Design a protein around this ligand. Structure first.
Ligand SMILES: Cc1cc2nc3c(=O)[nH]c(=O)nc-3n(C[C@H](O)[C@H](O)[C@H](O)COP(=O)(O)OP(=O)(O)OC[C@H]3O[C@@H](n4cnc5c(N)ncnc54)[C@H](O)[C@@H]3O)c2cc1C
Ligand SMILES: Cc1cc2nc3c(=O)[nH]c(=O)nc-3n(C[C@H](O)[C@H](O)[C@H](O)COP(=O)(O)OP(=O)(O)OC[C@H]3O[C@@H](n4cnc5c(N)ncnc54)[C@H](O)[C@@H]3O)c2cc1C
Ligand SMILES: Cc1cc2nc3c(=O)[nH]c(=O)nc-3n(C[C@H](O)[C@H](O)[C@H](O)COP(=O)(O)OP(=O)(O)OC[C@H]3O[C@@H](n4cnc5c(N)ncnc54)[C@H](O)[C@@H]3O)c2cc1C
Lengths: 462, 460, 460, 456
């Protein structure tokens, strides 16, 4: 009994329907493979690379308490290093968890069918979704189009796979020679040397590792799930889940956040505390958006499999740099649009709606190439998914700054935290200081120019 | 397409494997049967009757939120009433859970028989035990007999069940005709109006219902599981888990107690938190006693002699009434056993230490018969589970020595016997022999505001 | 220049105006004189004495942080005693505080007129009361007669006392070997020997020392004083302030608490929190009664000229000593009565509402001589003063079926002290002997075996 | 019987010996006079002028509960109105509290010189100090030279006054000439009204709040004053400066409870606390040294400046100074100053000396030219204390920034741009070699103003 477990994005030792199977047959030794030779343009971002650089030491320490080791390996020809350890340990099946980005379904399918050459087979599993992306059908076996009708379907199926248990103890493979070309994390070029501390001060407002995701989940529900309904439009403060980074990397089983959040939604329904019950629907509706991402990405091919889906690939964005240089620096001249970008670079996370503020501003007002923008988004955000992000820059494809600010920001407290220079305007007309009278600004300490960035462009022509 | 569940001691829906398994094949219809006289002498006790009357009503709301209603039949011909309720819907399935009491075992092999022979399908499930007591083997087909040997093997076979989720939208069928006599719990014979006002005062210390179980669990594991290894032996107040009733009635799925109490055990091991790693494995071994009862009842053969298997069937040695009239009134004299019985009579629960002190003195020194022993616990103890009771007495078949390891400061005796508010611990645990002056200066004159020790410990 | 500060019942450093006045002239060194040969019948009780022994030792450490050393002395005659201190110190002035009990006014009256013969200036300083018992008169200069006729007159006073700070550094003065006839505490003997191991169990519910006082008052006012209206008549739990013993021994200054609430009340006086405003008023009146007590004990006849009003020794007494030893052991039957004495004997303190029940008991429903009723209270109350206490046995000189719901609605007070009634329904606990047998036997209470019978019929 | 107490800078009813001194007698009538033209330059700034608005709104609502009333007289001339209200009410006493600033010193003496004509006696009471500087004459009348020399004699001679009780009853007793409302007594202008809105987030005036910050501070954080006082980060300071300035809390009562817990920790041998206490009462301490020099000599011995800073020429220009309140001085340790001081009206002491010392020693502006601006925006504008520190001044942005900002998170809280540099660089970005610059998000000149200075 010898089996290899290949790890991609399931760095958790609780509710893994790939790992959990392996503990039955016999001993194992896991494997992480990093091959930057095949990703083409889909190479990871700048801090997302940082993320994997951190949880690994957290995870690999975990097997040292369950009696084994995660054994990292770099290479170009993943098949060969697979062919290597197949030669050095004599296991027969290589279990693993599915992936759904279309830079992976080509990688998996080819390596498996080239793995039968040695009479070597494989069983793939589902360890990151609620429903299969091939389960939901219409009446005639077609793909849905409206998520709302989609969510009703998944909401009344109630069929899951299993919430498996955690294994008791691993069966460890002894060792092997050093002809696999890598042993330690540093040789993996996840993070460059010139930016090692500079890309490390995000550790104040973050702490990866599934051990952390457990603390953050339990502390979340009992404390502030009752107020998620009356906070999801509040951009200020930690007013939402903050479980975006963990989910993309598979550190907390989303089919576990679906139970431990479900078993509270029933309690308030029993007590008829309809306030708390109403907050639970938007949350679970939240996760359901994520299914709409991948399910479409598999039923339809991603963005038509080309540059963009059907219409926005050759739109004449102004072929200019400094505005694009200005869009990210935080000097566009607007309170909102410049607000978060001073914070995006600060901790690599923004509210879910503010992103939809900043996003539409560039392509629809600055007229800059989204490829220059989305690439920056992939370049900077922690949890920069491949599938949902391209969904994000489709709903943003098809806004008076005054009105939407008050609803999003009622009392002018957000801008005062990420733009301290404007801490002396009245709560009225703060979000659009260029519209107020000239003399009231003199009443404050805001003078556009040398002490505050004038607006790059205005809506009068925009 | 149509099924009829049948709850016996699984008053819970989160992880009810005999429940979700019915939700997928169509529609369901819950039921609860009461066995008034087919229990013979195994009629549940007084207090234990009360806990059920508070658990069901709370539970009846819970399934109501899911869109269904629990029905309640009271008869001594279970196969008959179940055979009647079948013809109201024509279901081909009747699910339940596996139980190992000597009276429902025989009740179960027949009900399937009268159903399989009559030909209507039925599935059982397992939802009360991690390991089924037929799985564990020693070499080929023999059982173990040393619990440490048993537990040493359970820690090395992780193959077990899979905790399901709770369903979403349950659909009953019709509930058409009440000819099955859909009796109400108030119409169900659970208590007596004469004694009813007294028993309701138990709510000052407990609150039944499965939903309260969860709010206690997270209240437990996140707060005091880290130091349970240094609070199990301190009899005073609330130290232990206080889960014993909720696990007897299936108020909470035991396995989920074994997940959320393991993940908080692997974290400390990774962190070198050597203290917490000790207190974790003195709780998960705590549950381990629980299975070991079940594994002796079924796979070891039952009491071939009377209920007490092969130890005490000849030497009761007494038929007194006044002594038994004195042992349960807290007028014994020993200021440790007295502090218990008033604790039991006041809240219907004791700590595991005291449950082995009031017993040992109840037989080794008071000369009373064992049979009188078990039933009095059997009538009042909230968590009176029979399998975990014969184990309680076969473990047993001066207090100052044992007065130190369990309660050193003597804080306990000054909570339930306030007459001794002015005695130091050097004489609180045995007043009969203290110096004559110390009793005078304190508010204790033997016999007048406290009775002497009922039997001399020194000789007998 | 050189002075001798005298400590009698004001063991505090903050706001001791007799001391701060001597914090300007020169060097000071404290003194505590003891003589158990001048009080005779006024010898403070058993639990009273332990308060001194557990407050002085707390005080002495506080004065040594400022460069001083409280000396302690025994003597048969204080006059000859203090003259010894002149023998070595050779100081010049003498400052003390005023008292009002009938034993001190005679002694201290001799002190002034017997030290001027030695050409020694001597002063007093009234730092224990709010208003002088002699300054308040009627319009015609006669005294008042009734409390409420007096309290309104005391809410508009002009010539107030003064608040003081604590000095920084005290210049001590070392004279010679300690003294004649005595030592620190050993020869004064605040406690006998064998009584010591028992008394220490009082520390669980009290902690002497003025340093603990300030922690309490700040903890009491800004946390509990808002609800004093709704807790003044609830017997269970720490309803009232729990300040009585400190304010007797002067461990806190009465003119500092009275300020700390008035400045507090005016805050609520602005926001229209009358319910918070009104509860503040009762505590204010609570100080009014106590001050009222010192009034009539000075300008009205000395203890009314007798323990019984002037003679009051002829009416029916029927001295049956059996009940007395029967009463104070808490075995009388009336569960509220025996509730008290099982708290009075375990923490040396009761709620004042309770103290008017039992006090009515020993004389009315039992006919015992009142002097037997003081000898117990004086012997075990931790705040057994002389002046307010005589008021207690004078304010009195009612059916429990009613007042039971008056002061303990749900009956929590009985079940905390008497646990054997833990299974009566609440509407019967306050009077069991009216119960029907179908509920006594149905509960665990058998009148006459474990819980004593009524000592006497209520219609007697 | 009636007496006219005269509230000047003691807006509180607790421990006010200029008020309760009337209570022994009888009816009173409080009045508050303002004159925006007799103070000349000392016309209080925008910051302090706003603070006055809340307290009087808070005191008037306070005294009325005692069955009384407090008008709001305004005048062209102070001495005139008092004799005017005299005739209307016909009292015999006009008590008030002292103020030891020379601009108002002579004023009270001017009214002590006119009241003896009418034959109504006056009584001034000590309501701001533990030691009214007349008694502390040492060595027969030669004042001290340092502070600690001054702070020592008072200790061994620690005689004080008696903390007087609060009052119980205030039975009180036409147009007090051309009586004016609250808003005609202009403390604000029309424009600056809404901009004063956000300042409420930082403070909440009123004597009824001073006690809370007092009692909360004494029993919660006074242990950590010895270890937090040299930390710019967070709230590691009492923040009791304004509440103490306007007489909203009796300064001696603060010394009382402080000394109480001090000796308490001496009992339990908590040696760590006992240094936390003695350091703190030193904090109130040097305040007393301010008025001690301001009495025995007028401030700077005659005028606003001692005798010197008229030579030693300045960098006569405003575009330099125009940067300062704009907070573009390059050094984030300074530009973290103005961005706060502009937005809160308060700065920690240590930052205050590193910003104050800058304008004269590096920017080289006129010293008075910067002091005046502080009077406009610091919520604690006080001549007898502002001139103290400015006379206290007359280093390295990294060598000193290390003690008071170990992680720099104080800068990443007020300077949202620089949130991505290592802690050992964020005080002087120009030293960070270029490899750590473009990788980080800052390029000086566009993403952050270049330091307009030569560092040496
Ligand atoms: C004479 C006698 C009779 C008893 N009768 C019962 C009975 O009817 N029902 C009952 O549940 N327990 C019985 N016990 C055991 C004991 O009362 C309980 O197991 C335990 O004290 C309950 O406290 P707890 O819930 O805090 O236990 P904790 O140890 O704090 O944790 C709760 C869990 O501990 C388990 N556990 C701990 N010790 C034992 C044990 N010795 N045997 C079985 N399970 C154990 C329980 O199953 C329960 O699920 C008896 C013991 C004796 C000596
Ligand atoms: C029969 C009888 C006997 C009493 N014997 C004593 C005694 O020996 N010693 C003693 O100190 N008090 C005695 N009292 C007064 C009162 O019962 C106690 O002071 C009791 O402690 C009041 O509760 P408290 O002080 O804890 O309430 P708190 O709120 O803690 O105290 C209120 C304050 O007001 C005073 N006070 C309140 N009510 C009264 C009152 N009716 N008379 C006098 N002062 C009052 C208390 O001394 C205290 O300073 C007696 C009262 C009665 C009716
Ligand atoms: C150049 C300079 C000018 C200043 N101008 C003023 C001014 O106009 N108004 C003003 O109120 N304060 C002034 N200060 C004092 C200093 O600004 C205060 O410490 C700070 O503004 C408030 O902090 P704090 O009250 O919480 O200090 P804490 O120590 O927590 O407060 C204790 C109290 O002691 C006094 N105090 C504290 N530090 C000092 C100090 N360094 N010098 C004098 N007294 C002090 C204050 O009354 C303060 O409220 C000045 C200090 C300097 C160096």
């Amino acid at each position: 009994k010898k089996t290899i477990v290949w790890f991609r994005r399931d760095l958790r030792i609780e509710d893994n329907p790939a790992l959990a199977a392996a503990a039955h047959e016999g001993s194992v030794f896991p494997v992480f493979i990093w091959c930057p030779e095949e990703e083409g343009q889909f190479y990871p971002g700048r801090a997302s690379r940082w993320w994997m650089k951190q949880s690994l030491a957290h995870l690999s320490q975990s097997l040292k308490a369950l009696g084994s080791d995660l054994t990292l390996i770099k290479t170009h020809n993943t098949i060969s290093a697979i062919l290597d350890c197949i030669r050095v340990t004599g296991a027969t099946k290589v279990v693993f968890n599915h992936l759904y980005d279309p830079v992976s379904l080509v990688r998996d399918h080819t390596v498996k069918e080239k793995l039968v050459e040695r009479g070597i087979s494989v069983q793939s599993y589902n360890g990151d979704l609620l429903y299969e992306p091939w389960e939901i059908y219409c009446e005639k076996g077609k793909p849905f189009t409206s998520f709302n009708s989609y969510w009703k379907k998944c909401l009344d199926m109630s069929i899951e796979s299993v919430m498996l248990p955690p294994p008791w103890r691993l069966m460890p493979i002894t060792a092997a020679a050093e002809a696999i070309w890598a042993c330690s994390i540093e040789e993996l070029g996840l993070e460059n040397e010139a930016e090692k501390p500079s890309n490390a001060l995000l550790t104040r407002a973050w702490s990866p590792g599934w051990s952390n995701a457990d603390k953050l989940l339990n502390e979340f529900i009992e404390k502030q799930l009752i107020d998620y309904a009356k906070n999801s439009k509040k951009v200020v403060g930690n007013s939402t889940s903050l479980l975006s980074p963990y989910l993309h990397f598979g550190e907390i089983s989303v089919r576990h956040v679906f139970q431990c959040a479900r078993m509270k939604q029933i309690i308030w329904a029993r007590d008829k505390n309809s306030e708390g019950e109403e907050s639970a629907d938007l949350f679970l509706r939240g996760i359901g958006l994520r299914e709409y991402s991948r399910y479409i990405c598999f039923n339809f091919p991603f963005t038509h499999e080309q540059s963009l889906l059907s219409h926005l690939r050759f739109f004449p964005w102004d072929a200019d740099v400094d505005k694009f240089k200005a869009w990210r620096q935080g000097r566009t001249g607007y309170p909102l649009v410049d607000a978060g970008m001073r914070e995006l670079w600060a901790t690599g996370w923004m509210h879910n709606r503010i992103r939809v503020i900043v996003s539409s501003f560039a392509v629809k007002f600055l007229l800059l190439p989204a490829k220059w923008g989305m690439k920056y988004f992939w370049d900077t955000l922690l949890d920069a998914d491949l599938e949902c992000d391209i969904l994000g820059w489709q709903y943003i494809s098809g806004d008076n700054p005054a009105l939407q600010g008050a609803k999003y920001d009622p009392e002018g407290e957000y801008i005062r935290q990420w733009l301290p220079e404007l801490a002396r305007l009245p709560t009225e007309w703060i979000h659009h200081p260029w519209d107020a009278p000239l003399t009231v600004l003199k009443a404050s300490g805001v003078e556009l120019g040398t002490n505050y960035a004038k607006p790059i462009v205005d809506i009068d022509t925009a």
